[PDB]
Design a protein around this ligand. Sequence first.
Ligand code: P1K
Length: 355
Amino acid sequence: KDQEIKKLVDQNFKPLLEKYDVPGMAVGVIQNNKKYEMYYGLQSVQDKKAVNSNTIFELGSVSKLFTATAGGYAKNKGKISFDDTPGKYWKELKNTPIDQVNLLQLATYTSGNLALQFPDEVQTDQQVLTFFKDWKPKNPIGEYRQYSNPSIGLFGKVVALSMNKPFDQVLEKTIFPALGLKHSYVNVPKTQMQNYAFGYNQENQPIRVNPGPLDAPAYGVKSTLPDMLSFIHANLNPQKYPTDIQRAINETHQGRYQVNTMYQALGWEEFSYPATLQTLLDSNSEQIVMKPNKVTAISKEPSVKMYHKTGSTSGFGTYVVFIPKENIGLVMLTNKRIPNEERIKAAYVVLNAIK
Ligand SMILES: *[B@]([O])([C]N1[C]=C([C][N]S(=O)(=O)[C]C(F)(F)F)N=N1)OP([O])([O])=O
């Protein structure tokens, strides 16, 4: 049966390279603590350099999972409460309309007035602080989800202040080591630059992510396929990790609210398992990703859960999914974006075929 994992990944992921002209791709499956890595094509077209276990890809919004885990770690070490407001930590946002929003609401996008992106004009630490002070409510706080890089990005920055280290050191010095990751970075160091893939835009130009305001917590992490499989392993099978980080991971798995069939946990999207294909696809629909939606309390607490998250930068696509009770998960990393629905579908066919 194990000798089917490669075949299935070949059948479902491999065709996407030709269909979308993707130079390179890494697909990982973990099943019953056993890892499978499938590499395709090139990390650099110009250099004729193959994707391999050393290839570093940009995770985009999948970084949000690390931010959430870092939040979970900080809560369980007593450094923050999800009930606190940013103003307790960012002394300067005190008494501003933002400081009626609590840390959970930010992490889970329900401030009621935050968009997918900051305005292009905002770049400096100084413009960031200004944006937040001037911020005013629109929807009743807590009531509406609009997916937002500023929302979780501020949560991210707050988690860092609470640990008295800049966000980058929180991940590189604390979170990544605890998860046993060897090649995951906020800032790819000089000795790894040769392992850093070019991303490729829709014009097949080589590109990498540009510095941006509160980028690290929102979409600024880079990682390898082995590291991401280790991250999924930790999610699937946490009891093995330091108690600190087991607690942090548990915290990211708890659903906070729903939007019909999608449960918002911390970073992760949660669903009842088995989920229909369209349930998974809907989490990534324009309605959900791009538009405000009123939430509801969790009514059905799913017995058996599965979790996913997509990620994108201008030249990179990412998807991660896991099902604890099947003890399986999948990671897809590309150095060109392909439609989210393509990622989700391919993963669905493979994980279903094995389990
Ligand atoms: B996250 O990856 C955050 N995200 C994605 C986008 C789409 N813009 S982009 O072209 O992919 C590049 C950018 F991020 F802007 F740098 N904007 N913010 O979100 P998802 O993958 O949708 O969950």
